[PDB]
């Protein structure tokens, strides 16, 4: 009745959560957050992104000029969306380097085509086949230009092109593989023809074979596409004696921000800063296990499902007249306004306070990392391709085994990331307990004994003032000493 | 005729200590440390869990087209299909244009199940052999290709196609022949040049024999170009020649697998092992490994260090009458039954205790830290190449940039983990030694006093019994309270 | 009665000083400290030094017009380089080129480092050899590329060509070769009688054939003529064939093939009279920080590469600026001090004094600096690479090349980001520790003596003159000998 008991504690909750640290692998904390991005909407946000959907187009049959694809011409994006629906209807064709095409034509962004007169005298020009209605007539490619005999004569051409421009030309062209010897001779007279694209730089030299093409639509003949870029400068030559698909211009080669991306989730009307196949994602968490193929800004991709960042302390619940004890045996359920306080038995009665200054310096570290965690965007737009179809050896050898080495280095970061965090975040709010006893005991002076369960047992009167003046920073221990040394030193 | 005790708090110390990197320390000792950098191996490939298929004197690409000394893997499978450098070609004279493609996309195949399929080829005259490709006392030719050649002094034009109606990926490999004179082309093919044409809707390869170019090779100037098309279901091949055809006899089954190929002259073993290296097969137990940097399978991760020293102890400070002394001066090298413990000095002479609770705390936590570092398993099967014999240039850049930028990346966070763990378990175990000293003094209130060097100064008698109860947690303070304050404060 | 006889007060504290710096913790983005330092190279003086490493400045000359010989780059025949630096003030002079996969050519000899040359004397009886062109000219006569000939009309006939070299001794041989786009059908017949040429370069692992084009090369230097350039590898005891019946550019010879730490540099920094590890093309750098925002294109021994163009290392503790009554390291620091890190400030019978203790500040000094030797150590030395800056669009390739180094950036300024955070967390605790530890050290050689007033100062109840504070400072400390008077002003008795 002559004394007063001041325990120090700390909070607790019915729940808990399990992270992992350094030393264990499931340890209990108060609060965690999620730092792996698992889900996604399934739509594809058309902001704030140029999307543009292929829908039954890809972007070559668009580049070329296949009729039902003419909405597409001159047309930019961002990202263009490849679905798996497009289709070819017009003529039978081929692309060696079907991928490098596909690329660059998506890195640029852009389909507006420029075109060229070319001299073309002495040849016929714009032919057509019934593969390839555009309406109701036999057309062909809108980009390309099909040369064939002109009065039962087919010259040598030599054609050229200069480039006076301060920017790059991308030529699209091709070769005819004609079905028979009729074919051959009835549209170029000659037994063979031969087609050489030249720069001062490069030459594609392509010679025809007479059917070497399966049947495909009604044809068992077929053209190859080739493209060449004309830096400024540099001059186009066209040299050919039979079978030569003629560009109409130029594609202008921009660089930017764009890609291509293989995907059927539809559009939405909505605005989202990361783009999966599976949909658009968010990135308010550092990492994400949606897809590996990514557009924009968007969470790194990890092998793990899951990865809790701990944001509280341990969780040690109290699991039991009334009788109070301090943080060594267990926490406090019952304080909800605060991480850290004291709870005191004197001559008014007893009650709970929580301690702001500790509370808050234990959040402000624990939400600083956090900041720290979140702080990195890395925006990424046209990358590597992830997913192959067609078997090729060497080249996707080294294409896999890059992005397979990136995603286990990144996966490992984020396991020790998460580990060496909690294991601080642990440690930063055991010192904030430690720190509080430790400025509590050399407030008493010599007026108080620890009792070794977190609590002080003060010799002296102690109403709710005097543990006020504790809490507060304002204890003056003269005014109680000689009180509490009397009781203290009795033999 | 004493009234006092003195209780000492301190480690143990061992005589052969253990060298380790901190963050802060190159060299600092401890008393035990595990090796986590594996760097010796049996020099034995281990014949389980995986498939091993010892290719002898025989290369995959033999194997695959049929050199009849490798007829014995004919539709042979593996998971790792090991190439000895005793391997030798002894059939017709060959090449193939980009070799390693095949081989790899072969290799991850990994089987060579071959599917008859038979060709009209009317027309023509099939099964050509030679002299250079005996198989047995027979003129023959390679198992899987049919050497097609002139039939009444005369060889039409072919026109044949296979259809892919499966559901699965088809591999057809075939060649051109490269007569050594105009007089050798003619008695075989009638017409002066040859053209191979083979054809997907995807794709198109178009050979044009030369005459001539080959070099002289086990007795002739001629040879044949190897090429392989895969056809895709529902599509078709189209195969067609007006001379110097080398056809195929069907199609490889494509397949999707944990199989690939290992260069490698080390003898195959009974034993089992998760890892294969070309050095022979090595534990996966550790976490990396210095051994090789190719490695097929569950295997630890290629580093530039050859020693990686994990601390699995405190700090090691050698004890070196004599007045008991604490953990403040030094370590305890006659402790053995924990890590922590009491040596204390009464009236009943001296004892040496070991506190089990400390011990364990120290000991869990080290092994938590262990089973983090032990449970990345790390499986990888069919990679890239990583050591090369021909001079490349731009493709083997990238393929030696990608695999040394990759042994950088990891041999970084190597020896970071190693220093933060070490640094962690250094800092752990210091921890328990001042928690155990405290716990300590808050049992004793008002009845003992730090003497400094990490003892305290008991100021009662203090038998045996008396000092089991603080040892295990008992001891009342209240017992001896007026005898301590009594002995504690004489003026 | 209070305070009857007289106390003493000794005061623990650590230094301030007034221009701290700002560091990144695991904690903080901005906490400020005493002593940092930069570990992010970020500046050159724009020079390429002459050493350590063999420079070799090509000036007018690329490396492949000094490879095949255009006149005005004969000075680089036979010449070595560990860095080649080409110009980009270059040019070619001579007869009109292309070169498939120019690439790998250029960076296979840019690897062995070497143009030695030596010259095989082929066979070319029934031809006629060292063929030249006015578009070349060498002096003033009309020459051709130094390690290439052209062959052409015998007595107006040209036949089907069967050459052999064998590789009789050891390590490669390289062959540099070429085949003749001529402008027009006279061109061709007048110079290789058959309608078309035929260029066949084989060896027993390869072959390598070329049909050339008529007028398919666009006028470049007075010509509509061209030669594209081919080139082939011929191992230890394999052999080199050349069939050719028109058209064909042989060779003179192979360049001898070595493997070592040779490469090219694209840069225009003029070269110096220095020394210095690691060269840019922005320059050379110095290599004492472990990272470098200059280029991520290096050669030698260099910083890595990070997106950071700062990483600022925490090199001493929090700085925490600084009645007569003296206070401790709990209140704030002590700009004062200025001849150690920590230290007392005492208040006694014959004044006020302050001393640095020397054993707590080397102990934090050498952790500092245990952590600077593992940080600095790091020489990484990386010679021939992969390009990392293109000028002409390719696509698949092209985007794998930048695709691996973009990431392998980002990684090492991820490792390099959070490096700095967990070593200046570091930092911070052990500066705090060793303060604790020495505050523990006083509280516990001082006994029933003191107490603690919380500021962390003792109150020492018992006269304590200078020596007295001496001998608590040195830890000559004996607390029997003021026991008695102590604990009867403590407790009254
Ligand atoms: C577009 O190309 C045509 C055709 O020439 C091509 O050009 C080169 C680059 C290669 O692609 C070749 O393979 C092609 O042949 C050019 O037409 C020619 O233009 C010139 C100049 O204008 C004409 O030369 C004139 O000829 C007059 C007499 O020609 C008449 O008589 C001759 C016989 O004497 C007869 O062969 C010809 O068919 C005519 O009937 C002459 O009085 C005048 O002074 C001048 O020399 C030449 O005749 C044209 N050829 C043809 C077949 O029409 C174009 O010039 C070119 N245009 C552009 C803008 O480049
Ligand atoms: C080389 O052989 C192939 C294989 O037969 C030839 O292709 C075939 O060409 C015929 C031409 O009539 C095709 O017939 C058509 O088939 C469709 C299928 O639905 C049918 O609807 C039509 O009424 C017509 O009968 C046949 O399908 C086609 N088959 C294949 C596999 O391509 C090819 O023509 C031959 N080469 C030459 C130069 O003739
Ligand atoms: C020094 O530290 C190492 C820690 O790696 C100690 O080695 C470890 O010792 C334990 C028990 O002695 C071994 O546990 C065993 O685990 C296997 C399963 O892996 C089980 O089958 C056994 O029954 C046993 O429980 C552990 O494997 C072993 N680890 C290593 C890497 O050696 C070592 O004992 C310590 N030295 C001293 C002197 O304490
Ligand atoms: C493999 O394909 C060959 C083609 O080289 C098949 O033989 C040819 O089959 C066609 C169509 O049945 C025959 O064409 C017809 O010939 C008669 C002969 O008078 C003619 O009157 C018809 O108007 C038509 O043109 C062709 O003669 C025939 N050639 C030969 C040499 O037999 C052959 O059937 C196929 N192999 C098989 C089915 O085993
Ligand atoms: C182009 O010239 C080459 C080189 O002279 C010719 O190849 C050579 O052909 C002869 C043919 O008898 C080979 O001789 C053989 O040597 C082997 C090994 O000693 C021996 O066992 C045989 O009995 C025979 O004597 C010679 O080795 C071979 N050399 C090379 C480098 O290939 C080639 O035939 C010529 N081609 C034309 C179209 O002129
Ligand atoms: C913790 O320390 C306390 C104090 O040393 C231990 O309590 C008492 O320990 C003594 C000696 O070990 C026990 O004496 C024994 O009692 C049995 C039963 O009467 C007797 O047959 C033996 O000859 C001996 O005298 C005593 O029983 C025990 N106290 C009680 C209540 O059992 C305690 O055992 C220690 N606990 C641990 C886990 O070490
Ligand atoms: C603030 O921190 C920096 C970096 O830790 C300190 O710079 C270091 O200063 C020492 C000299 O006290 C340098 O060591 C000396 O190097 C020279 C050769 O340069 C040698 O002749 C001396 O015998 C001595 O070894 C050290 O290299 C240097 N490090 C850096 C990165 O600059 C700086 O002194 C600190 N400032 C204060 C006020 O503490
Ligand atoms: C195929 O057509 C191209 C272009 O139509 C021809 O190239 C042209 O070749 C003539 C050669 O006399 C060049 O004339 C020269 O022009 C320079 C610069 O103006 C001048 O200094 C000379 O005195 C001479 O007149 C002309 O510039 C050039 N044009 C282009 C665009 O390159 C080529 O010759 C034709 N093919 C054949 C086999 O003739
Ligand atoms: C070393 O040399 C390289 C060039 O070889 C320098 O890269 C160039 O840096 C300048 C900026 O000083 C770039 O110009 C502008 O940069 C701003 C960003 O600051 C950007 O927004 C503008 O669009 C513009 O690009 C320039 O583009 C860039 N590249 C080239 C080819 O000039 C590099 O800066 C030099 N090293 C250091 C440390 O500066
Ligand atoms: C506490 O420790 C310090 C450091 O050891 C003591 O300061 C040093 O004290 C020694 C004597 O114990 C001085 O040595 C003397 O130097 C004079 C120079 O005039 C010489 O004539 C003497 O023969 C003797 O060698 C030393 O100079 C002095 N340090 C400095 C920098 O002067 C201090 O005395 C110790 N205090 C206590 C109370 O233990
Ligand atoms: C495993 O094999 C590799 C390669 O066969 C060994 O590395 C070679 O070591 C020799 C030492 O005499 C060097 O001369 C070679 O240059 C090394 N080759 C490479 C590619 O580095 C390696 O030492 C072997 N490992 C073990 C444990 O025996
Ligand atoms: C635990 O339960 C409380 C009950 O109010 C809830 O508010 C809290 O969100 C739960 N924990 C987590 C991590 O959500
Ligand atoms: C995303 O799509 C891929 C491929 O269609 C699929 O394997 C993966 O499970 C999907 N993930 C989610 C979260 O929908
Ligand atoms: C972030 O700081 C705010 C500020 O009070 C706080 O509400 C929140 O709980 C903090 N986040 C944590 C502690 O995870
Ligand atoms: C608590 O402290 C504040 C200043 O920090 C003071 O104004 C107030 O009076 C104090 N409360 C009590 C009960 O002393
Ligand atoms: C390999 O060839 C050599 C020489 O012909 C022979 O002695 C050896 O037995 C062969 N080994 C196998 C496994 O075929
Ligand atoms: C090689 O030289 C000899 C002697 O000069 C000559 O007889 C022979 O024809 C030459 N071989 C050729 C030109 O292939
Ligand atoms: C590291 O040591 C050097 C030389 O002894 C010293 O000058 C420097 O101050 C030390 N490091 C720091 C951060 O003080």
Not at 287 to 299: E, H, L, M, S
């Amino acid at each position: 009745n002559s004394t007063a008991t001041l325990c120090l504690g700390h909070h607790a909750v019915p729940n808990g959560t399990l992270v992992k640290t350094i030393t264990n692998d499931q340890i209990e904390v108060t609060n965690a957050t999620e730092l792996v991005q698992s889900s996604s909407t399934g739509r594809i946000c058309d902001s704030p992104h140029r999307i543009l959907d292929g829908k039954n187009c890809t972007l070559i049959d668009a580049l070329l000029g296949d009729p039902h694809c003419d909405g597409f011409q001159n047309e930019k994006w961002d990202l263009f969306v490849e679905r798996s629906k497009a289709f070819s209807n017009c003529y039978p064709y081929d692309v060696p380097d079907y991928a490098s095409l596909r690329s660059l034509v998506a890195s640029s962004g852009t389909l507006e085509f420029i075109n060229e007169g070319f001299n073309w005298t002495g040849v016929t020009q714009s032919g057509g086949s019934y593969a390839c209605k555009r309406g109701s007539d036999n057309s062909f490619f809108s980009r390309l230009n099909w040369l064939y005999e002109s009065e039962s004569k087919y010259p040598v051409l030599n054609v050229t092109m200069p480039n006076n421009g301060n920017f790059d030309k991308l030529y699209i062209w091709g070769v005819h593989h004609p079905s028979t010897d009729k074919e051959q001779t009835k549209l170029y007279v000659r037994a063979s023809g031969r087609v050489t694209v030249s720069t001062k730089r490069s030459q594609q030299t392509i010679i025809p074979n007479i059917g070497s093409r399966p049947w495909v639509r009604g044809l068992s003949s077929g053209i190859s596409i080739y493209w060449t870029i004309v830096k400024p400068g540099d001059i186009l030559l066209i040299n050919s004696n039979g079978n030569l698909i003629a560009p109409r211009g130029y594609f202008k080669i921009r660089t930017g921000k764009s890609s291509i991306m293989r995907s059927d989730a539809p559009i939405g009307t909505c605005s989202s800063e990361c783009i999966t196949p599976n949909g658009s994602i968010p990135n308010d968490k550092p990492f994400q296990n949606v897809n590996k193929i990514t557009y924009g800004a968007c969470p790194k991709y990890v092998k793990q499902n899951t990865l809790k960042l701990a944001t509280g302390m341990r969780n040690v619940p109290e699991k039991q007249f009334g009788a109070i004890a301090g943080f060594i045996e267990n926490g406090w359920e019952g304080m909800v306004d605060g991480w850290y306080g004291f709870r005191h038995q004197n001559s008014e009665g007893t009650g709970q306070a929580a301690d702001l200054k500790s509370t808050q310096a234990a959040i402000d570290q624990i939400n600083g990392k956090l900041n720290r965690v979140i702080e990195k965007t890395n925006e990424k737009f046209h990358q590597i391709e992830k997913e192959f179809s067609e078997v090729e050896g060497r080249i996707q050898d080294l294409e896999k085994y890059v992005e397979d080495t990136k995603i286990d280095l990144w996966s490992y970061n984020a396991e020790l990331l998460v580990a060496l965090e909690n294991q601080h975040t642990i440690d930063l709010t055991d010192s904030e307990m430690n720190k509080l006893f430790e400025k509590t005991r050399r407030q008493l002076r010599e007026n108080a004994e620890d009792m070794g369960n977190g609590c002080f047992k003060i010799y002296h009167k102690c109403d709710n003032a005097c543990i006020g003046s504790i809490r507060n920073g304002t204890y003056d221990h003269d005014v109680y000493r000689d009180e509490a040394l009397n009781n203290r030193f009795q033999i």
